[PDB]
């Protein structure tokens, strides 16, 4: 189960960014 | 007055706000619902008295039956 | 989801479908927190005012689906409920407080590119990320509009978290500690919201400190959908973290 939790294999793991995941991250730095 | 949202009203109240009657803290199905919860060790569970074993922000509650949601708050005066 | 966009594929692998056995109809959404347990909104299972009472038998889960319709044959997993667990003090007689519930799958799921669990916030994540202004993101196959209209594909909408007091005044229903409301204010000249059909669907946030995604909440309710000056409420997933584990490492 949950240990490899929250790491999407077609993104985080391929190292790709979902088309808006960024809208969320910038939301904190700002 | 009841200070902390009855965080310790340890009285002999025994009726939900609707005039319904609290089912025994230890009924065998009041104990059921009560087990996966997280109850605090100060608030002693007295017979069928309204208590706030939780810390329920809202106040003192009690059981009213044996199914989820089958509980109710109790009418005291907070501060 | 109202004013969302089609989900990319494999973008939210933890998203689950809670389907009523027959009529084969879509009732709510959910998350894979592990390979054996699905987390949802209690009210999806229980709501007497609406003669709603499902048992681990009138329902079934569907994992790794993209399209609302097509049975995506080598992608998706149709799993069957083993047991259900409704929060003992899930207040359906008032404000739908503690809208949490858990489903134990009969036979464990096999993680694929398209099926993977989300994480539960630890006090530190929860604490630093649950802050007004932060955006998290909803996903559902629920209605696209408050009225008049069901997606063909999973949708998304990132909504910023709102200040409790703004939420508080947002309505008449008693908002509790085990709730957060999120959405755009009327002047932010942006919109988006989860709508009916969306429940159980996950409110996730990505973490800066480590890059894991975290279920911070669950689509609980709200008034209408995308209405101005109203927010959508979410279960505080953090807040029922112990009951979550009390039950899991229970049996
Ligand atoms: N914009 C929104 N987020 N709307 C809410 C969507 C979630 C939706 N929830 C619901 O419909 C829940 C269950 C019963 C009444 N309800 C609602 O959301 C009611 N419309 C508001 C309500 C709150 C508290 C008590 C009674 C009614 C669901 O899928 C279950």
Pairing of strands C179-182, C155-160: unpaired
The tally of domains found in chain A comes to: 1
**Residue recorded with tokens 């889960």:** C61
CA dist C28 and C163 (Å) reads 27
Task: Provide, as residue numbers in chain C, all residues whose Cβ is less than 8 Å from the Cβ of B34.
Answer: 88
Q: What is the CA radius of gyration of chain B?
A: 11
Report the gap between the CA of B12 and the closest CA in chain C (Å): 22
Widest distance between CA atoms in chain A: 34
State in Å: Cα C22 to ligand 1 middle.
23
Burial of C55 (0-12, 13-18, 19+ CB in 10 A): exposed
CA dist C250 and C115 (Å) reads 25
Resolution of this deposited model, Å? 3.3
Cβ–Cβ below 8 Å for A21 and C206: yes
Cβ–Cβ below 8 Å for C35 and A1: yes
CA-closest candidate to residue C171, choices C119, C229, C213, C91: C229
Give the C-alpha distances (Å, rounded to integers) separating C99 from A8, B9, C40, C63, C79. 27, 27, 8, 22, 23
Q: Which residues contact C251 (CB under 8 A, 6 or more apart)?
A: none
CA-closest candidate to residue C27, choices C57, C3, C61: C61
CA-closest candidate to residue C70, choices C15, C151, C182: C151
Query: Is the C-beta atom of C15 inside 6 A of ligand 1?
Result: no
Minimal-distance CA residue to ligand 1 atom 5: C221
Give the C-alpha distances (Å, rounded to integers) separating C224 from C40, C163, C179, C193. 21, 20, 18, 10
Our measurement of the distance from residue B4's CA atom to the centroid of its chain's CA atoms, rounded to an integer in Å, reads 14
Task: Provide, as residue numbers in chain C, all residues whose Cβ is less than 8 Å from the Cβ of A15.
Answer: none
* Partners of C137 in the β-ladder: C158, C204
| Distance separating the N- and C-terminal Cα atoms of chain C | 35
CA dist C30 and C115 (Å) reads 12
CATH of the domain at A6: 4.10.140.10
Cβ–Cβ below 8 Å for B36 and C243: yes
Give the C-alpha distances (Å, rounded to integers) separating C203 from C44, C151, C215. 16, 19, 6
Q: Where are the beta strands (DSSP E) in chain C?
A: 5-6, 15-20, 25-32, 37-40, 46-47, 52-53, 59-63, 77-79, 81-86, 101-105, 135-140, 155-160, 179-182, 202-206, 213-222, 232-236
Pairing of strands C155-160, C135-140: antiparallel
Q: Residue C23, preceding bond cis, omega within 30 degrees?
A: yes
Handedness of CA A13, A16, A20, A21 (dihedral sign): positive
CA dist B54 and C239 (Å) reads 13
Domains and CATH numbers, chain B: 1-79 (2.40.20.10)
Chain A residues 1-30 with a CB less than 8 Å from chain C:
1-2, 4-12, 18-21, 23-25, 27-29
Domains and CATH numbers, chain C: 1-12+118-238 (2.40.10.10), 13-117+239-251 (2.40.10.10)
Give backbone dihedrals phi and psi of A27, rounded to 5 degrees, phi first. Answer: -60, -20
Cβ–Cβ below 8 Å for C211 and A7: yes
- Measured between CA atoms, the residue of chain C closest to residue A24 is C135
Query: Does residue C219 contact residue C196 with C-beta atoms inside 8 Å?
Result: no
DSSP string, C72-128: -TTT-EEE-EEEEEE-TT-BTTTT-BT--EEEEESS----BTTB-PPBPPPHHHHHH
Please name the member of C34, C116, C205 whose beta carbon is closest to the beta carbon of A9. Answer: C116
Instruction: Give me C34's structure tokens.
Output: 């592990």
Give backbone dihedrals phi and psi of A22, rounded to 5 degrees, phi first. Answer: -60, -35
Mark residue B59 as left, alpha or beta (left: phi above 0; alpha: psi -120 to 50; beta: remaining).
left
Q: Within C143-235, where are the H helices?
A: 164-170
Provide the domain limits for residue A30: 1-30
Give the C-alpha distances (Å, rounded to integers) separating C55 from B46, C48, C60, C104, C219. 33, 13, 10, 12, 21
* Partners of C222 in the β-ladder: C232
């Amino acid at each position: 189960g949950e240990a490899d939790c929250g790491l999407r294999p077609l993104f985080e793991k391929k190292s790709l960014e979902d088309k808006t995941e960024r809208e969320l991250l910038e939301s904190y730095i700002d | 007055c009841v200070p902390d949202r009855g965080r310790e009203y340890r009285g002999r109240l025994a009726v939900t706000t609707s005039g319904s009657r609290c089912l025994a803290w230890s009924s065998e199905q009041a104990k059921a619902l009560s087990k996966d919860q997280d109850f605090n060790p100060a608030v002693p569970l007295a017979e069928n008295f309204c208590r706030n074993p939780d810390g329920d922000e809202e106040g003192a509650w009690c059981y009213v039956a044996d199914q989820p949601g089958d509980f109710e708050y109790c009418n005291l005066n907070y501060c | 989801i109202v004013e969302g966009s089609d989900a990319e594929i494999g973008m939210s692998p933890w998203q689950v479908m809670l389907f009523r056995k027959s009529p084969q109809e879509l009732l709510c959404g959910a998350s894979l927190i592990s390979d054996r347990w699905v987390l949802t909104a209690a009210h999806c299972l229980l709501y007497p005012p609406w003669d709603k009472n499902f048992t681990e038998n009138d329902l079934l889960v569907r994992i790794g689906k993209h399209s609302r319709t097509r049975y995506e044959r080598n992608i998706e997993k149709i799993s069957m409920l083993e047991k259900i667990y409704i929060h003992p003090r899930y207040n359906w007689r008032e404000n739908l407080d503690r809208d949490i519930a858990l489903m134990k799958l009969k036979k464990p799921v096999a993680f694929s590119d398209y099926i993977h669990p989300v994480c539960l916030p630890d006090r530190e994540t929860a604490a630093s990320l649950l802050q007004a202004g932060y955006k998290g993101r909803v996903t559902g196959w629920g209605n696209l509009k408050e009225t008049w209209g069901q997606p063909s594909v999973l949708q998304v909408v990132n909504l910023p978290i709102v200040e409790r007091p703004v939420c508080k005044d947002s309505t008449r229903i008693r908002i509790t500690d085990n709730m957060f409301c999120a959405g755009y204010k009327p002047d932010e000249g942006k919109r988006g919201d989860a709508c009916e059909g969306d429940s159980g669907g996950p409110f996730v946030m990505k973490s800066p400190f480590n890059n894991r995604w975290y279920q911070m909440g669950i689509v609980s309710w709200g008034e209408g959908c995308d209405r101005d000056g109203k927010y959508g409420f979410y279960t505080h997933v953090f807040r029922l973290k112990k009951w979550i584990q009390k039950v899991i490492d229970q049996f």
